[PDB]
Amino acid sequence: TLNGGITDMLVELANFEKNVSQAIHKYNAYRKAASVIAKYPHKIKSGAEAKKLPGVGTKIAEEIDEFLATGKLRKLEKIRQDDTSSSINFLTRVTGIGPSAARKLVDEGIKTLEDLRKNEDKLNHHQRIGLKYFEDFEKRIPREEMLQMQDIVLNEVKKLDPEYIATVCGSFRRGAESSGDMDVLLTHPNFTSESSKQPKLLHRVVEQLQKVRFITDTLSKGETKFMGVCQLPSENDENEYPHRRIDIRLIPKDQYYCGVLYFTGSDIFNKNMRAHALEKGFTINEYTIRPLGVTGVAGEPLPVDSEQDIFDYIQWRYREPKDRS
C-alpha cells in the first residue's frame, strides 16, 4: 500500500514470539503497532516520524530506520536462516532415512554439506547402503531403459520352469515416459488359498538373478517380499548406468488377477470403481469379489480366470490401462 511493506514485517515478528519462544505481552505489543500504521493515511519515510503516533514505541521505531535504508533486518532473517523450521526442510536434504532419528542426529551438531563428516559419531547407515547410492536415487528413469529391465527378468523366470507367471505394474503399465522405480508380481499353480506356504519359490528366482550379476544388494528378506538394488550391463561406453531400485512379491494363484488390478488402476480410479459395484450390488477387495445383498453379509467368492471376468460381473464396458486415470 503506502507503509504496507513494514506491516508484512511486523506480522512475522509476532508469530515466532507466539511460538518457539512464547513471550506474551510482547506478542501483544508487536500486534497493536501494526494497526496504527495501517490506518495512518500518509507514507512514512523515517522511523523518526513514527514515535509521534500513539502506537509505535521505543526500540520498535528504531528497527524501522534499519528497514528504511538497506531494506533488510538483523533480528529477522537470523531467525529465518537458523530455525529448526526451514531446516526440517533442509535436514532431511542429504539423508534418505527416517522420521525421529533426525534430532539426535541433528542434535549432534551434524548437518548438510561441510557439516557432514565434521561429526560422524552415529555409525549407522541405511541399512548399510543408503548414504552411498544417495546420488542416483534422486533421478527419474527414462522409459527406454525400463523396457530392457523388463525383458531380462521375464527371460530368466521362464527358462527355470515355464509354469511361472509374472507382470510389472505401477506408472509403467499406465504408459508413462519416465518412472521412479520397478514393482513386479509372481505366481504358480502349486500355491493357492487352501495350501501349505512356500518361500522356496521366491528364493530360487532371486539367487539366479545374482548369478548373472543383475542384482547387486539386499535391503530386506522374508517369506513374501524382497527389497533391493539393480544395474544394466555395458560394452564399454561412459562411466555408468546409475544404480536403481526394485521390489518383488509372491501371491496365491487364485487371488492373482485381483491384486494386479489393485497394483495398477490408480487411487482415484480404484475409488470410483468400488462404488459402482455397490450400486449393481457387489463388494470388491484386494483379495476377492463376493455376492452381497440384503444386509451386512457377503456370500461365497466367485471364480475368476482373467481381468475382464471382473468387469462383466458389475456390468461395465472394459477399459484399457492407458485410460485408468
Of these partners, Cl ion, Na ion, none, which one is at the site of residue 176 (CB under 5 to 8 Å by kind)? Na ion
Residue of 254, 251, 260, 253 whose CA lies nearest to 302: 254
How many Å apart are CA 54 and CA 46, to the nearest integer? 16
Beta bridge pairs of residue 246? 182
Q: Of the two residues 115 and 207, which places its CB atom closer to Na ion in the complex?
A: 115
Q: Of the two residues 56 and 169, which places its CB atom closer to Na ion in the complex?
A: 169
Among 3, 150, 167, 171, binds Na ion (CB under 5 A): 171
Q: Alpha carbon of 248 to those of 137, 169, 181: distances in Å?
A: 18, 11, 12
Report if residue 170 touches Cl ion, rule: CB under 5 A: yes
Of these partners, Cl ion, Na ion, none, which one is at the site of residue 126 (CB under 5 to 8 Å by kind)? Cl ion
Residue of 192, 194, 197, 214 whose CA lies nearest to 205: 214
How many Å apart are CA 141 and CA 259, to the nearest integer? 25
Neighbours of 29 (CB within 10 A): 13
CB of 177 to Cl ion, least distance (A): 14
CB of 232 to Cl ion, least distance (A): 15
Q: Of the two residues 176 and 201, which places its CB atom closer to Na ion in the complex?
A: 176
Binding mask 58-97 for Na ion (x = CB under 5 A): ----------------------------------x----x
How many Cα atoms within 13 Å fall on the side-chain side of residue 287? 6
Contacts (CB under 5 A) with Cl ion, residues 229-268: none
State the first-to-last Cα distance of the chain, in angstroms, to the nearest integer: 45
Report if residue 168 touches Cl ion, rule: CB under 5 A: yes
Contacts (CB under 5 A) with Cl ion, residues 92-111: 97-98
CB of 307 to Na ion, least distance (A): 21
Among 176, 227, 304, 314, binds Na ion (CB under 5 A): 176
Contact region with Cl ion (CB under 5 A), list: 60-68, 120-128, 244-252, 263-271? 120-128
Neighbours of 258 (CB within 10 A): 20
The answer to whether residues 294 and 288 touch, using CB atoms and an 8 Å cutoff, is: no
Q: Of the two residues 18 and 126, which places its CB atom closer to Cl ion in the complex?
A: 126
CB of 226 to Na ion, least distance (A): 21
Q: Of the two residues 153 and 182, which places its CB atom closer to Cl ion in the complex?
A: 182
Contact region with Cl ion (CB under 5 A), list: 69-77, 123-131, 271-279, 297-305? 123-131
Of these partners, Na ion, Cl ion, none, which one is at the site of residue 172 (CB under 5 to 8 Å by kind)? Cl ion
How many Å apart are CA 198 and CA 190, to the nearest integer? 9
Of these partners, Cl ion, Na ion, none, which one is at the site of residue 61 (CB under 5 to 8 Å by kind)? none
Of these partners, Cl ion, Na ion, none, which one is at the site of residue 299 (CB under 5 to 8 Å by kind)? none
The answer to whether residues 289 and 258 touch, using CB atoms and an 8 Å cutoff, is: yes
- Alpha carbon 45 to chain centroid, angstroms: 49
CB of 139 to Cl ion, least distance (A): 16
Q: In degrees to the nearest 10, what's the CA dihedral of 131, 135, 139, 144? A: -110
How many Å apart are CA 258 and CA 310, to the nearest integer? 9
How many Å apart are CA 93 and CA 263, to the nearest integer? 29
Q: Of the two residues 5 and 142, which places its CB atom closer to Cl ion in the complex?
A: 142
Binding-site ranges for Na ion (CB under 5 A): 92, 97, 171, 176
- Contact residues: Cl ion, CB under 5 A: 97-98, 126, 168, 170, 172, 182-183
